[PDB]
Amino acid sequence: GCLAPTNLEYKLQWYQTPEGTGNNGNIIANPSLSMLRDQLLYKGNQTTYNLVGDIWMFPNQVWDRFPITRENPIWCKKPRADKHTIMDPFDGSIAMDHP
Amino acid sequence: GSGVGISTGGWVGGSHFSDKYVVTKNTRQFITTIQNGHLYKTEAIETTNQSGKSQRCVTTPWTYFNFNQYSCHFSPQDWQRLTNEYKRFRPKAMQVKIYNLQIKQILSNGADTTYNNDLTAGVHIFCDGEHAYPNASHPWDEDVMPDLPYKTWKLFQYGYIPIENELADLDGNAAGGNATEKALLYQMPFFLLENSDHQVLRTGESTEFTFNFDCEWVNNERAYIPPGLMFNPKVPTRRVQYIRQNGSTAASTGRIQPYSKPTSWMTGPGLLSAQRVGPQSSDTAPFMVCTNPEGTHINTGAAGFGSGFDPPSGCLAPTNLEYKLQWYQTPEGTGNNGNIIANPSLSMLRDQLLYKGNQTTYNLVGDIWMFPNQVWDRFPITRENPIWCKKPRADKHTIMDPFDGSIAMDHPPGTIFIKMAKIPVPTASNADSYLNIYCTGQVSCEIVWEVERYATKNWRPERRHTALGMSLGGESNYTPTYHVDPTGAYIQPTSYDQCMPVKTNINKVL
Amino acid sequence: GSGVGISTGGWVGGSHFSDKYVVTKNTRQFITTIQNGHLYKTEAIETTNQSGKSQRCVTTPWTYFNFNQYSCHFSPQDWQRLTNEYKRFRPKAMQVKIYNLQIKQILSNGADTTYNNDLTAGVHIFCDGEHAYPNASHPWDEDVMPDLPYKTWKLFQYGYIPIENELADLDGNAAGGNATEKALLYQMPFFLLENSDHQVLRTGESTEFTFNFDCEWVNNERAYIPPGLMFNPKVPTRRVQYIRQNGSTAASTGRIQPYSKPTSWMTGPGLLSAQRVGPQSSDTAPFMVCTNPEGTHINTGAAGFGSGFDPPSGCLAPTNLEYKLQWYQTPEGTGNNGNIIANPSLSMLRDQLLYKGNQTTYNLVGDIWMFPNQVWDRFPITRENPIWCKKPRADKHTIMDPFDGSIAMDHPPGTIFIKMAKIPVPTASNADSYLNIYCTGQVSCEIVWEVERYATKNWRPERRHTALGMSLGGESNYTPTYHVDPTGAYIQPTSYDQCMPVKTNINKVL
Amino acid sequence: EWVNNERAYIPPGLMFNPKVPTRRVQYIRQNGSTAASTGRIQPYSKPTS
Amino acid sequence: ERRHTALGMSLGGESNYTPTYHVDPTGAYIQPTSYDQCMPVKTNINKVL
Amino acid sequence: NQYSCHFSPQDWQRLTNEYKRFRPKAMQVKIYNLQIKQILSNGADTTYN
Amino acid sequence: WMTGPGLLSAQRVGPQSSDTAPFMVCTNPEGTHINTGAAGFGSGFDPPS
Amino acid sequence: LADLDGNAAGGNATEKALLYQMPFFLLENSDHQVLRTGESTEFTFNFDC
Amino acid sequence: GSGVGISTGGWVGGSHFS
């Protein structure tokens, strides 16, 4: 979420009304042109730079949020558990206690 | 009375110390210029190399007051008394007044360059305060209010970056030539400060603004022990151990020693793995954070075009000079004479480390992210650090916790913009003409700091900022750090013991 | 307080959007000059060719503020938000303020050309508002308030045409020499703005005027079907047909098909038959409307001396480039680089046609006049079109309906005239002398627009003004349409998709 | 919580004014060869928190 | 600022025409093609950050 | 739970163009006008009464 | 939803009798000590993962 | 008006611009009454004609 | 009234923007 997908495997594909059945029906969920989204982090060694694949929560990260389209779910169920985290679903849906 | 010949306000200065506040008043003398042609343009900034890079930087006729540093509000005396006598402080409110304006006309024949005031000329003065326009101030910028009074403070032009220049490019057509390159240009925000309603002032007028601050405290205290030492080493603990077989060396099960008990607490986040890159002249490095809507660009070349994250490994042992702050100092040098290294503060909630044991001995973990139970405290702001930083508008974020030490506020005190009203001149067609004038006046920034006093049960004497850590000298010599040379030079503080960082003093029991 | 050294008013700007209004505030910086000798004269305008033509044009020392365009009141942002979010709008009221005047004296030795203010000098400021004097403003004229703030706006001289020059002539005596030629000259209205009572302002003063508007709405909606498609094609209609024998091909009587039912509604008026004429340089063409009290002149030569009717075939298919609007744009070019074609808006109450069937197939009717049941809608004003036009005082007229798209009002907001008081100088006899000064100040035009929001039962998404129809670029490139060049140039909007015409968006069900 | 329809148009790292100088210096490791030097951050490309 | 135009809609409905949000000659509803149809939030307006 | 069920394409367009942020306050659902039919199948008729 | 945080990579070290291990968290104001020897003098984080 | 029909024929661009905005009206968008046998309705009207 | 032969509620639809 909030990283450059760098491949099709990291993306949303709706599909659409149930047929297809693919790949005719699916849609790729292209970037929204923010600029709080997508991004990247490069780690410089002595010479040039290399993309850091996995970057976890770190202070000062500010990523905005997935740009929900008209077909996205409105909310999602937020599990009952002691602790959790920012939450921030990557599907774009709102996580509510008691939807 | 009012009008020309009547001073609109008086000078004001000095600080006052009370149990619950320090109200620090400062008045400075400022100057403006025509600041381009009164017209905005835009500028690709000339880059030294030019290997490649640029920035779009629409520039404005406006110029702005930047109040953000501690050194401008506090004298070295007052900073000393603040960091020694109080555990924590935050600003409640700030009040600024522009008054006693003199608008002079610049008359240059090539020799005289006379200056005679023009009444009826005026200056535009606009305090954003909604943060509707792109923020002018940025932490660590020069353009801050100068340290000393009696030094004229020259205002700096206001400009801002529209869409990042590396993204589009184009440049290439049919090269390409890409379509998403242009989609970023077609929407490029373009901000005029004339869109907003704002005041025009002739000589007789003054203005005032104020502000209010919700900001978090900045804490002057030191830990004296890591959080892992809370335990009483006299009493036994039950936690046992085990171990893997490893070896040979058949594994055994045994109790934790009374000393060296377990710790639930963890090392504050920071990233040590990265390294600076190459020529300088840009960016430089490490941990460049950039956006790459796909593909842009990608390409990719050259690698790493984007904003760098300068002081990673906040609350970690720096382990090298590259991870540190270096101020410099007043703009020359130019290095390395002027820079200062920002040495450790001796907490003990700062610095730290994390070692990862394999079967045999231990190895430093370079990059450690946010993890529960991490408690790192915060950067020990000195007198030259910025007070606040602008906190971006975005949905989610994180602890924040800037590593520069500055407070991250939603709505920092709004930047105050000033330009001088264009005075047009009759001319043949085109010929932007106008008239060469400059404004001069007095800004008085009165900020109230909510402050609170320490009380300790420690028997032993605590550390304080002595002023015997000051150093000569002033070219030739003598002239201690906060003082003035035989020439008017102010002999900026050498090293890190001068400028008196917070968190070095008092104590916290944790 | 009051007097020199006290700004009389502040800058003001920006627009505000509410359900029922958009109040758009704009402040500009203006400049005046001595504008002839303070004396009127009259001028036969030098004509390029000079095949023949002229105009009488009594010129005045006065100069005037022309507020009539949409682009001056609305930013591209605000025009976009207006045309996207609202079906119709009209101005309720306008308020103008002249304030912060600087009257400078021009001192020229041939080199210095110094400028030093003269207090006690003054400017005359007169708002007609009764339309007792000939109107200064005319649609599509430059002299309108400039698009951008921060651009100085140079005022343009006020002049008006007394009796048409072609009518008299004379010129010929005994040639002749005609008697009715002179009868038109003997009564030639001659207007002095000093006849009227008006204000004189020194630096300390400001003025304000306001206004009120009775004007009709301008509607942003699109038809999506001609009025002839109202019918339900599923249900049968009774209207029968017949036909003539023609042929051979013996005529038969039969029912109208369910599709293609009759229509009571008719094509809006317009005239396609005329053509442009020749050299340019005057008039040019088509449909010159002129007066010819008999015989004058008649003669006749050369043919067609009179005012041309530029955009005939309002609400008709243009069928050629000659029938269209071409803005240009900021004054250079000079063509054809600057001009823009004013493409169709895709209503469907616009454009259209009428075909006249003879026995075999159909033929376009070139000129179609007012006829009952014609319903044509109206020209889709863009951001650069004039807001209003002056509606002549006359007994009768017609629908009106200007083809330029501008609103025709009885009593448009009165033109505001400004000259600088003649400052005389001692001299030997004759020697009109006086003194060279110029005025500079700030006009703030605050106009309130009555506005109303659309609601549609359409399921499907409607068209909007994207801003992705904007185009590069700024010499070299990038710098999208509403934005500023690396040089201060503003990169005027290319084509017709930029500048965002009304009636392209939303829908009307008819 | 709200769902926000807005776009950033710049990364958060571009907040700075590129016209004004910044003090933050740099250093670098020796690397190389290529003896390391200490120098100021350029006015463009300022640090980002 | 950018807006959702509805000129980014696409044909078509088998055979053709029948733009995205609309109905085929058969009762089919011709679901929106790609991502420009269905109009995601955060593409429009701006935030100054 | 979807946005497409509550908003028409027209209304989604007008929502994402004209407003910076939105959240639902309240939802109200009504089940009414119930018809309970019996399915009678002999293998051919499959009548419904 | 995602897995709660924890660290499985580390291993206990050697003789016991101190500290023992894994994930020793310690402070090292530079250089102290650094040295470095022996490695890992500081408080251990006992139940990671 | 559109036609298209022809592609590359053409194939014209303004042909499609008329299709992309094609109003499509559902009477279910509106709020309206449902009646069983027991109910009746009444409306009236008024005429300025 | 109530019972079979009386519609319990009417259709409703459309959105409103404020």
Per-position DSSP letters for C122-174, written without gaps between them: -EEEEE--S--SPP---TT-S-BPPSSTTS-EE-EEEEE--S-TTT-----SS
The full 3-state SS of C250-309, as one line of letters, equals: CCCCCCCCCCCCCCCCECCCEECCCCCCCCCCCCCCCCEECCCCCCCCCCCCCCCCCEEC
Tokens at H9, concatenated: 């024929």
**Residue B249: partners with Cβ closer than 8 Å, 6 or more residues away:** G14
To one decimal, the resolution in angstroms is 2.9
**Residue C504: partners with Cβ closer than 8 Å, 6 or more residues away:** C83, C222, C345, C346, C347, C380, C463, C465
Task: Decide: residue A2, CB within 10 A, 0-12 exposed, 13-18 middle, 19+ buried.
Answer: buried
Work out whether the CA dihedral B151, B154, B160, B166 comes out positive or negative: negative
| Inter-chain CB pairs, B–C, below 8 Å | 149
d(CA B165, CA B154): 29
Residues of C in contact with F8 (CB under 8 A): 459
d(CA B217, CA B372): 23
d(CA C7, CA B103): 13
Nearest CA in chain E to C80: E1
Q: Which residues of A touch F (CB under 8 A)?
A: 68-75, 93-94, 99
How many CB atoms within 10 Å of residue F8?
24
Residues of H in contact with E6 (CB under 8 A): 20-21
Q: Do C84 and F17 touch (CB under 8 A)?
A: yes
Q: Do H36 and I5 touch (CB under 8 A)?
A: yes
**How many angstroms from the chain centroid is the CA of residue B405?**
8
| C-alpha pair distances (Å), F35 with each of F38, H33, H36, I8 | 10, 17, 11, 11
Residue ranges in chain A assigned as alpha helix (H): none
Q: Which residues of E touch D (CB under 8 A)?
A: 2, 41-47, 49
The distance of B373 to chain D (nearest Cα, Å) reads 23
CB C269 within 8 A of CB C353: no
Q: E and G: touch, per 3+ CB pairs < 8 A?
A: no
Residues of A in contact with B404 (CB under 8 A): none
d(CA B455, CA B461): 13
Percentage helix, strand, coil, to 5, in chain H?
A: 15, 5, 80
The distance of E40 to chain D (nearest Cα, Å) reads 9
Q: Which residues of H touch I (CB under 8 A)?
A: 28-39
The distance of F25 to chain D (nearest Cα, Å) reads 10
How many CB atoms within 10 Å of residue B465?
22
- Chains sharing 3 or more CB pairs under 8 A with chain A: B, D, E, F, G
Task: Decide: residue C404, CB within 10 A, 0-12 exposed, 13-18 middle, 19+ buried.
Answer: middle
Q: Do E43 and A28 touch (CB under 8 A)?
A: no
| C-alpha pair distances (Å), H44 with each of G24, H31, H32, H34 | 85, 18, 16, 18
> Closest to E49 (Cβ–Cβ): which among D4, D5, D8?
D8
* Residue of A56, A57, A80, A85 to mutate, interface with G, max G Cβ within 10 Å: A85
d(CA C119, CA C134): 33
* Residue of H25, H26, H27, H31 to mutate, interface with I, max I Cβ within 10 Å: H31
Nearest CA in chain C to E1: C467
Percentage helix, strand, coil, to 5, in chain E?
A: 0, 0, 100
Residues of E in contact with F17 (CB under 8 A): 3-4, 44
HSE-up of E1 (CA within 13 Å, CB side)?
25
d(CA B154, CA B159): 16
The phi and psi torsions of B279 (rounded to 5 degrees) equal -70, -15
The distance of I17 to chain F (nearest Cα, Å) reads 8
**Residue B138: partners with Cβ closer than 8 Å, 6 or more residues away:** B389, B390, D15, D16, D17, D20, D22, D46
Selection from B405, B348, B353, B381 nearest residue B223 by Cα: B348
Helix axes C76-85, F9-18, angle to 10 degrees: 150
Residue type, C223: A
Residues of C in contact with E21 (CB under 8 A): 459-461
> Closest to F33 (Cβ–Cβ): which among I8, I15, I17?
I8
d(CA A11, CA C259): 48
The distance of B361 to chain G (nearest Cα, Å) reads 6
Nearest CA in chain B to A5: B294
d(CA B481, CA B469): 9
Selection from C478, D15, B397, E38 nearest residue A32 by Cα: E38
Q: Do E4 and C467 touch (CB under 8 A)?
A: no
* Residue of H26, H27, H29, H34 to mutate, interface with I, max I Cβ within 10 Å: H34
> Closest to H22 (Cβ–Cβ): which among E8, E16, E19?
E19
d(CA B33, CA B18): 40
Residues of B in contact with C484 (CB under 8 A): 39-42, 58, 190
CB C89 within 8 A of CB C22: yes
Residues of C in contact with H30 (CB under 8 A): 457
Selection from G3, G45, A57, A56 nearest residue B373 by Cα: G45
**How many angstroms from the chain centroid is the CA of residue I10?**
2
> Which 3 state secondary structure label does DSSP give B123?
strand
d(CA C80, CA C84): 6
| Inter-chain CB pairs, A–B, below 8 Å | 121
The approach used to solve this structure was: cryo-EM
Q: Do B291 and A38 touch (CB under 8 A)?
A: yes
Selection from C263, C288, C261 nearest residue C277 by Cα: C288
Looking up tokens 């249900």 gives: C235
Q: Do A27 and E42 touch (CB under 8 A)?
A: no
Task: Decide: residue I14, CB within 10 A, 0-12 exposed, 13-18 middle, 19+ buried.
Answer: middle
Nearest CA in chain G to A57: G5
How many residues make up chain E in this entry?
49
Looking up tokens 């709405």 gives: C217
Ordered DSSP codes for H26-46: -TTSS-B----TT--------
Residue C446 forms beta bridges with which residues? C25, C95
* Residue of B256, B355, B463 to mutate, interface with G, max G Cβ within 10 Å: B355
d(CA A60, CA B287): 13
**How many angstroms from the chain centroid is the CA of residue C447?**
18
Q: Which residues of A touch G (CB under 8 A)?
A: 79, 83, 85
How many CB atoms within 10 Å of residue A73?
16
Q: Which residues of B touch G (CB under 8 A)?
A: 226, 228-229, 239, 241-244, 246, 249, 252, 254, 256-257, 259-267, 317-319, 344, 346, 348, 350-363, 371-372
d(CA C260, CA A35): 53
The distance of F8 to chain E (nearest Cα, Å) reads 9
CB C474 within 8 A of CB C191: no
Backbone torsion region of residue B61, taken as left when φ is above 0, otherwise alpha when ψ lies between -120 and 50, otherwise beta: alpha
Residues of B in contact with D44 (CB under 8 A): 45, 47, 53-55, 57, 282
Nearest CA in chain E to F20: E45
